[PDB]
Amino acid sequence: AYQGFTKLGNREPLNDIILWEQITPTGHSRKEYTPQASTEYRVGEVLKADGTKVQAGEEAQADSVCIVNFYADLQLSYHGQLKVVGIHRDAELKDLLTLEASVDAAAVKTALAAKGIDFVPTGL
Amino acid sequence: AYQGFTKLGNREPLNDIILWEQITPTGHSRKEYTPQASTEYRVGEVLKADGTKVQAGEEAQADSVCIVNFYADLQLSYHGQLKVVGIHRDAELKDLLTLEASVDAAAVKTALAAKGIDFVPTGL
């Protein structure tokens, strides 16, 4: 390469964090969000009630954990769907959250736990 | 496809504009440029002496015609080369030039003609 090295990017995280879910004919633990303008989404991120990612100082507003990869430039998810989906109640997930800069993980976990979401310890 | 459609782009032009050039052991009619930091290159663009593309008001400074597609982010050509190449003398080319906005084609052609570069008429 020009600098001597070139990287084509790592594989995006895929949906394998759900261990238990309230299986229902209509999604009981899942909610849909309209994607925000020019916002990239990935599995494991934390979203607010209005689809905006939780930032520092507002951990109390955490609502759900995203489980779908979304591309801002295509406006289409990696399965071709037009909407973002996240788990918001009654589920057990692996402890692989993605948080913004300077966000307090403990506060987010406590807020989510109030909705019935439990995190299982994950080995190295 | 959100918003109606999704386009993956057109194929880049192929290096076929060359019709005649006196072949010599060391490419008498070809010259090499150091690519600019953030400038994209394609086949059929007019370059100045310093490698920057010709713009309006300076058509008299036309130097050569790029014949290699260069990707700025990779900093490599489509053939995995580290330098740009252009024709600067004694060549016959198809009339397929590409010019920036408000660039007078006639002035560029007259400037290039002084160096011995001629353009063959091209049909639809």
Place this chain on the structure above:
Amino acid sequence: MLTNSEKSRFFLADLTGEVQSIPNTYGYISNLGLFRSAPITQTTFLMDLTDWD
């Protein structure tokens, strides 16, 4: 094997296999075979100790 180029959908490039890395796994003592298997039925067990002088 041929695949798409780095940044063009209409050009090809060659894919040269794969490389893998695996974590280490020490097993010296297990291979030594010092310990015997003594399966039991309950959740606890007892023993008696005696001595004299």
Place this chain on the structure above:
Amino acid sequence: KLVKHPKIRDAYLAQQTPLAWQQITGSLRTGGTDGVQAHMNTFYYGGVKFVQYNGKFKDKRGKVHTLVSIDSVAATVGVGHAFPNVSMLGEANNIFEVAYGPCPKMGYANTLGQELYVFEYEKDRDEGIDFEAHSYMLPYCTRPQLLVDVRADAK
């Protein structure tokens, strides 16, 4: 530290025997396999054989556990363990044991334990598969006074 000691270095240097030459200028890697190394360091002196064991595992919290290290002793201080061979007391008096317990699932109560159980279940509504692995065990020694710790420390 043991190998560099002058009382060993000179003692083996003055000895004109094939063993002495190998241990002072040859390779001490003549042991068996620990799972990573083809051979592991071995050293003979005073009728005893010393083996260097390298063992590390990652605790999921991040910190590293060293198998041979003693509790609350800095890694800069040599430490080792000594335990008896099987043959010292005889096979009739085996000293090490492991006990395996049962599993809380139905049909396993009051049943001889196994070292590993694996179960599989189908998620409801045909959504996927689930797995479980169980184990219930404890290793122990019946004569703990035969275990000794060696330190390359002064005090």
Place this chain on the structure above:
Amino acid sequence: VSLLDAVDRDSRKAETSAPERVRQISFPMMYFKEVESITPDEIQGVRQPGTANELTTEAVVRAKKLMKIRTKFDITREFLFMQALKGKVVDARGTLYADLYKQFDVEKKTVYFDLDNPNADIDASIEELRMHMEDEAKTGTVINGEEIHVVVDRVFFSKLVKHPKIRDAYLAQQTPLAWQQITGSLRTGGTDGVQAHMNTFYYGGVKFVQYNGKFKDKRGKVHTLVSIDSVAATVGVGHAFPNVSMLGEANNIFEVAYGPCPKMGYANTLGQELYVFEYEKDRDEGIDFEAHSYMLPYCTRPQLLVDVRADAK
């Protein structure tokens, strides 16, 4: 993988392992070219240097020029192979084409011997090198770190030989190997192409070989094969890389790629090691030659390449 943690039997808690990782990379290639020609003006009225009345012939000039071209290509290939073994690939002009440690995002390890200190422990450094080469393999199979190549510099070789810890240890031994290495001749290696034998030294199961290869650029600069980049010439340096038998043939680590010629008829043909072309001039004015090459040597496990330094810092 990590260690499991005990849980309460009646609580029915459990833990889970994390997923894996995957990524991709790419490489460019290096291109070389050569040009030569023959003219009748170099034949007419030219006395053969070895005689007094003999004139030169076209065949002699042709053979000399071809041999020169082939020698230049061989020298370039040797230099490129050495550079690849050193962990970075750069032409004689300093241009950087591959950075193995950047692409594979792994740090390079260097071992200090402190040969200037009488109390320096060479055994500790050798064991450190063995442990690095064995633990950092990450191949899921048994590794024998004793099998490694060690190319050494003249200064490093002299400093290692002079050390008292080696001198006295070998003096105390009444064995044929000790006699030969202290009073005999150490030149017992193979042939590097300039000398019949190469200096060889045995200690602690490791074999040290002294290499003095060097070349010159088009503009006079002298390039040394063994010298580490940016290290003073007065400090002993060297490189260590694994043997072929260390990992077996199924896990070969060193590869060389070859691409096609840019001429007609070679659009998508498998590249060869070298191309040679011949074109006669117009109006029988003379003859022309051309030579092409397109290659890049690379390593698939850069963490297994280790540097060695005589000093300690």
Place this chain on the structure above:
Amino acid sequence: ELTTEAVVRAKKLMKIRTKFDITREFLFMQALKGKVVDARGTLYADLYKQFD
């Protein structure tokens, strides 16, 4: 080329078995040292006190 369920199943089973083997090795070492403690540090058996 596409993955398949069989490969994923095999990989996960192998990972589980490896984890359990590693844990067993660690526990055997801890027992040999004299006291049995899990990775978290909980104390389960102290043979020196048990046998006085």
Place this chain on the structure above:
Amino acid sequence: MGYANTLGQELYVFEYEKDRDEGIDFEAHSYMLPYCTRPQLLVDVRADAK
């Protein structure tokens, strides 16, 4: 599960019993898109001129 990479059907139907013999549940799935490869051959007609 069981349909990860299989060819798509026109319609799927499934039946499931309830938790403790309470009834029966049904589900219907469909995943499709109709398209035309030469849209320029589609013409509209109007009754007026404007």
